[PDB]
Amino acid sequence: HHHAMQFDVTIEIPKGQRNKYEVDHETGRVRLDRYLYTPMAYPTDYGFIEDTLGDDGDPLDALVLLPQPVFPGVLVAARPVGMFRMVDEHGGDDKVLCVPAGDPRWDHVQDIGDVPAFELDAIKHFFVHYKDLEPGKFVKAADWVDRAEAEAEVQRSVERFKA
Amino acid sequence: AMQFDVTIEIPKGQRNKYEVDHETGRVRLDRYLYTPMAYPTDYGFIEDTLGDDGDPLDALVLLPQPVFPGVLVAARPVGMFRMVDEHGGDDKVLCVPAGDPRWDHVQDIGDVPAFELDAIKHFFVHYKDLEPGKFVKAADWVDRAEAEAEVQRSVERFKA
Amino acid sequence: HHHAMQFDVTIEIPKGQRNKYEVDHETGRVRLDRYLYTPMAYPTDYGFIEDTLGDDGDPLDALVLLPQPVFPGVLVAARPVGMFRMVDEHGGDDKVLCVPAGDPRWDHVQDIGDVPAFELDAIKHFFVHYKDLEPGKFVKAADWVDRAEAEAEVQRSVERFKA
Amino acid sequence: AMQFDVTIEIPKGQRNKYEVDHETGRVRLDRYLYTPMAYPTDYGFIEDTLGDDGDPLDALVLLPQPVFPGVLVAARPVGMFRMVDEHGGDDKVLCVPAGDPRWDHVQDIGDVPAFELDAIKHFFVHYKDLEPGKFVKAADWVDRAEAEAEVQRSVERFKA
Amino acid sequence: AMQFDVTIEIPKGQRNKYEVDHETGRVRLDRYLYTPMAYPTDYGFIEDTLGDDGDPLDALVLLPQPVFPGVLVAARPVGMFRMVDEHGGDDKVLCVPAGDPRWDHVQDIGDVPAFELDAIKHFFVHYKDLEPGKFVKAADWVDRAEAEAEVQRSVERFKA
Amino acid sequence: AMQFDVTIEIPKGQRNKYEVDHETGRVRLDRYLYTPMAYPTDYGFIEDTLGDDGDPLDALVLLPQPVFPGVLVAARPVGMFRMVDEHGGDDKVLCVPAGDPRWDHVQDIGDVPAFELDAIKHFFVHYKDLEPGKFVKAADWVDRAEAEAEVQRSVERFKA
Ligand SMILES: [Mg+2]
Ligand SMILES: [Mg+2]
Ligand SMILES: [Mg+2]
Ligand SMILES: [Mg+2]
Ligand SMILES: [Mg+2]
Ligand SMILES: [Mg+2]
Ligand SMILES: [Mg+2]
Ligand SMILES: [Mg+2]
Ligand SMILES: [Mg+2]
Ligand SMILES: [Mg+2]
Ligand SMILES: [Mg+2]
Ligand SMILES: [Mg+2]
């Protein structure tokens, strides 16, 4: 209702990285999965929401808008403003778009319409194309949905994690 | 062995698209790329050339570490990326540092790993995807002989 | 009227610098004036507007909001959204706040109210405090004015440059 | 010569205020500083201490090159920054690398240049200026003996 | 083919010598190097090994871009740097990323350019020149088979 | 007191060896160093001088933070590094920022720590170890007076 959703995001990959890092969900170790095969770099800080389980068996992915990147493993208390939905070779994948919680410099961003269109297009473009040069990888759908849909998915993923 | 000076405008890894104004010598930020992409190699142009697109001939230089915008690198050609976009031809000569024995094993286009050539091609095909009216009609790699003939023609057009 | 003001800014100091660089207006050489005496860093990319002369004998100062810093000497075509007015030991100083011209990712910033308040406060704080530990330096006034005042000052400075 | 391990949370030059959660060991971004300031030295806390503010005792470490967040540095105290803010005391122990002969000339607070001590003081006085209700009542530098006694007291409080 | 996890302690280009404390898993600053030198490759150790020096077996990993201290990289051996210094034997296994086809052309020590191997050797021969009581008696490159033998020795010593 | 403008060519920490072409003022990449070493100070030359080697007189500048290639720094001499190599004499003037009270404690060569002077020497003695036909016969530090004498010699040769 009036009480806004928040959660902790663990950042795995800082904005501007071509190294695709992963944080192990059991040990907390950071691993280099791979150097990307395309001349692309992560459009925002990238990671996952703590204590969630998405429909793909992993913690629910998160994209965080920041004034300055963090590094792999760093926690950021964040709030959702939208969600990126896609289908690739492994099926559906959802990524929640967030901003820092309790920071007045982000109060103007409350929903997906508050983010410049070209910035959302840029984020989409990354995920549509970053595996273009990897064999057997493809994208069949990609689109943006609003904060309300994002929050519904976060709540579902909290429930799956508890179960 | 052909050799020429390349002015690097954009270091490898940059999303800021720097451009030298050829009238004045100043470095300008043309744009922050609209796509989440970064230049796959150090990028610039060959000094004292005039290409078919009316500008100096573009050049890509393979390096172990990027330089700064505006830096000259003595280079030699090993191939060329030939593309056609909405405006016509837009050739980019692929080079390595001249006089450096660490690059002697790279003499022609077949000596550059396919993974690297494919990533360079991917960059130029897609980097303007989000700009209206921009698209790429053709994009192919050609050999050193092809590169050298084009450099020679562009040198002559600069002198004329 | 309907045709928006633009100009070229030469950036002297990238955002986040404690090295205070200057671009020579005759030679175009970059000089290190000094390392700042305070633990502060330039809040935005900082420089001056080409072909202007402010009331202090220098080209009119400019602050440029960017997604990523440039380096000293780089030109950026920009448009004004406001102006910072201050008085220090050398008298009045004015600094025009700008965003990149023709970039739709900045269309939402048209005037000084479109910049988050805390971000304007942060910029002010820099100029109020960065010379705190330098002998004989002080600030007696600092405030923000709108795009219309900024444009009037830019126009005056263009006129002074021509004269 | 007193020696202890400092966990660096924030490298010199950072506007991101990282903080170790002492319950879990994780690194958290507490905030991006609201002022245009940057940590004047590598900054963190002394392991196995419990200060008067209920938290581990804060430490500043002078280094020739910053480390990464979470890195341990064996350090020895040369002085202490004593402040009083709206909540009470908030001491910060000033240290140099232990066992490193390049720092042997720094033994007490008088051996650190005034310019550096003044910049550190300026940071802690002003960095929360734009946060409502935050202000600094007192801020002074004290010597190694003062630092050592406070470290010792904080070690004992951690054991109790 | 043999592969293992390498924990990188020191990214390429560093003059800070970081080390993992193998009891805790914490990263520590051992020291800032005394020479104007920087690690020529990402540097670390192979997880779940015990070298004859009593530490986990050292590893050098060739990469297109460096990682952060503490990062795991799945790697495979292509050779080994054998050194004898003041404290006796020292082996460092040279590796490339495992399961990455961009490195398939590197199968043994002869596939790494001599200029890179010479630079790596030069680092380890000279980086402790300005530290007292340090010297190197021998420094030599051996092939993949010898590297794999030492990894297996070190796996067995870890289990014992 | 003597002071002059130094143009910095190479920031501290660089393995790219940049040089200004003194006819044009352009920055050029001479080469990527063949050794795993990095410039220990910001490095350049004194404007409007002519050394006995026929180039502008080299300068090393101590700074709290490095600059960019091409940046001017007003500096004053505190000593000089004298070297004899394959091409004969080579002098490099050691400097600090002029008019900056944070450097007033450095008036002569004895005011710079031996660890820093030794590291600087080590760089110039070893950075060309893996380039053929290079060697150093002598490398020695001299005081401010000798440095100032050489600056004056080089000012006179520029005018002549
Ligand atoms: Mg998936
Ligand atoms: Mg997922
Ligand atoms: Mg072209
Ligand atoms: Mg003024
Ligand atoms: Mg002014
Ligand atoms: Mg405290
Ligand atoms: Mg070992
Ligand atoms: Mg050993
Ligand atoms: Mg030795
Ligand atoms: Mg010379
Ligand atoms: Mg010479
Ligand atoms: Mg030699």
State CA B144 to chain mean position distance: 14
Whose CA is closest to E92, among E10, E28, E1? E10
What distance in Å separates residue B115's CA from the closest CA in chain E? 7
Positions of A marked catalytic:
93
State the first-to-last Cα distance of chain E, in angstroms, to the nearest integer. Answer: 24
The token pair that represents E154 in the structure block? 């070190």
Give the CATH number, domain containing residue C140: 3.90.80.10
Q: Cα(C143)–Cα(B7) distance, rounded to whole angstroms?
A: 43
What distance in Å separates residue C123's CA from the closest CA in chain D? 7
The token pair that represents C116 in the structure block? 């988050």
Q: Are E118 and F126 an interchain contact pair (Cβ–Cβ within 8 Å)? A: no
Residue F61, domain extent: 1-160
DSSP H stretches of helix in C14-146: 117-129
> Which chain C residue has the Cα nearest residue A44?
C67
Q: Are F68 and B68 an interchain contact pair (Cβ–Cβ within 8 Å)? A: yes
The token pair that represents B42 in the structure block? 């150090």
CB E13 within 8 A of CB E66: yes
The token pair that represents C22 in the structure block? 């200057």
Of E119, E129, E130, the CB nearest to F36: E119
Q: Cα(B68)–Cα(B9) distance, rounded to whole angstroms?
A: 8
Whose CA is closest to C87, among C133, C108, C112, C56? C56
What distance in Å separates residue F92's CA from the closest CA in chain D? 23
Of D16, D26, D32, the CB nearest to A75: D26
Q: Cα(A44)–Cα(A59) distance, rounded to whole angstroms?
A: 18
Q: Cα(A7)–Cα(A45) distance, rounded to whole angstroms?
A: 16
Cβ pairs D/E, distance under 8 A:
33
Residue type, B157: R
> Which chain B residue has the Cα nearest residue E64?
B64
Positions of E marked catalytic:
90
C107 is in an annotated binding site: no
Strands F27-32 and F16-20: antiparallel
Taken as a whole, chain F contains a residue count of 160
Q: Are C118 and A108 an interchain contact pair (Cβ–Cβ within 8 Å)? A: no
- For ion ligand 1, residues whose CB falls within 5 Å: A 56, 90, 93
The token pair that represents C162 in the structure block? 């021509």
Q: Is B121 helix (H, G, I), strand (E, B) or coil?
A: helix
What distance in Å separates residue C64's CA from the closest CA in chain B? 12
Confirm or reject contact between E102 and chain B (CB < 8 A). yes
What distance in Å separates residue D105's CA from the closest CA in chain F? 10
Q: Are D101 and F115 an interchain contact pair (Cβ–Cβ within 8 Å)? A: yes
CB D68 within 8 A of CB D16: no
Confirm or reject contact between C133 and chain D (CB < 8 A). yes
Query: Using what technique was this structure determined?
Result: X-ray
Whose CA is closest to C21, among C56, C51, C48, C39? C48
Q: Cα(C59)–Cα(C45) distance, rounded to whole angstroms?
A: 16
Of E65, E70, E102, the CB nearest to A19: E65
F9 is in an annotated binding site: yes
Instruction: Show the 3-state SS of E60-98.
Output: EECCCCCCCCCCEEEEEEEEEEEEEECCEEEEEEEEEEC
Positions of B marked catalytic:
90
Strand ranges in chain D using DSSP code E only, listed in sequence order: 4-10, 16-20, 27-32, 42-46, 58-61, 72-85, 88-89, 92-97, 136-142
> Judging by beta carbons within 10 Å of its beta carbon (0-12, 13-18, 19+), is residue F137 exposed, middle or buried?
exposed
Strand ranges in E11-154 using DSSP code E only, listed in sequence order: 16-20, 27-32, 42-46, 58-61, 72-85, 88-97, 136-143
Q: Give the number of whichever ligand sits closest to the CA of residue E34.
A: 9
Chains D and E touch (3+ CB pairs under 8 A): yes
Of E102, E105, E115, the CB nearest to B102: E115
Q: Is B150 helix (H, G, I), strand (E, B) or coil?
A: helix
**Residue F121: which H helix or E strand, with range?**
helix F114-126
**Residue C57: which H helix or E strand, with range?**
none
Q: Cα(A1)–Cα(C4) distance, rounded to whole angstroms?
A: 42
Q: Are D29 and A70 an interchain contact pair (Cβ–Cβ within 8 Å)? A: yes
- Which residues in chain D touch residue E32, judged by CB atoms under 8 angstroms apart? 63-65, 97, 100, 102
Residues contributing to the annotated binding site of B for Mg(2+)? 9, 53, 58, 85, 90
Residue C39: other Cβ atoms inside 10 A? 27
Q: Cα(E146)–Cα(D83) distance, rounded to whole angstroms?
A: 60
* Listed resolution, Å: 1.9
User: For chain B, what is the radius of gyration of the CA atoms?
Assistant: 15
**Residue A75: which H helix or E strand, with range?**
strand A75-88
Whose CA is closest to E100, among E79, E65, E75, E69? E75
Chains E and C touch (3+ CB pairs under 8 A): no
C93 is catalytic: yes
- Eight-class DSSP state of F9: E
∠E37-E40-E44 over CA atoms, to 5°? 110
Which chains pack against B, by 3+ Cβ pairs within 8 A? A, C, E, F
Please count the structural domains in chain E: 1
Whose CA is closest to C14, among A15, B68, F13? B68
C-alpha C15 to ligand 6 mean position (Å): 29
> Which chain F residue has the Cα nearest residue B70?
F27
Residue given tokens 């451009």 in the structure block: B19
Strands E58-61 and E88-97: parallel
DSSP H stretches of helix in chain A: 117-129, 147-162
- Which residues in chain D touch residue C35, judged by CB atoms under 8 angstroms apart? none
State the first-to-last Cα distance of chain C, in angstroms, to the nearest integer. Answer: 25
Q: Are F65 and C30 an interchain contact pair (Cβ–Cβ within 8 Å)? A: no
CB C109 within 8 A of CB C146: no
A35 is in an annotated binding site: no
Confirm or reject contact between A119 and chain C (CB < 8 A). yes
State CA B94 to chain mean position distance: 6
CB B57 within 8 A of CB B154: yes
Query: Cβ neighbours of residue C57 under 8 Å, at least 6 residues apart?
Result: none
- Which residues in chain F touch residue D11, judged by CB atoms under 8 angstroms apart? none
E90 is in an annotated binding site: yes
Find residue B29's DSSP bridge partners: B18
Of B101, B105, B115, the CB nearest to E102: B115
Distances (CA, A) of A121 to A37, A126, C64, D76, F94: 21, 9, 24, 52, 52
Q: Are D27 and A75 an interchain contact pair (Cβ–Cβ within 8 Å)? A: yes
Say which of D21, D30, D52, D90 is annotated catalytic: D90
Q: Cα(F159)–Cα(A63) distance, rounded to whole angstroms?
A: 62
Whose CA is closest to F83, among F93, F73, F74? F93
Q: Are F65 and C31 an interchain contact pair (Cβ–Cβ within 8 Å)? A: no
What distance in Å separates residue F133's CA from the closest CA in chain B? 15
Q: Are A73 and D29 an interchain contact pair (Cβ–Cβ within 8 Å)? A: no
Q: Cα(A14)–Cα(A47) distance, rounded to whole angstroms?
A: 9
Q: Is F160 helix (H, G, I), strand (E, B) or coil?
A: coil
The token pair that represents F67 in the structure block? 């600059």
Q: Give the number of whichever ligand sits closest to the CA of residue F88.
A: 11
Of E68, E72, E100, the CB nearest to A34: E100
Residue E76: other Cβ atoms inside 10 A? 24
DSSP string, D96-127: EETT-GGGTT--SGGGS-HHHHHHHHHHHHHT
State the first-to-last Cα distance of chain F, in angstroms, to the nearest integer. Answer: 24
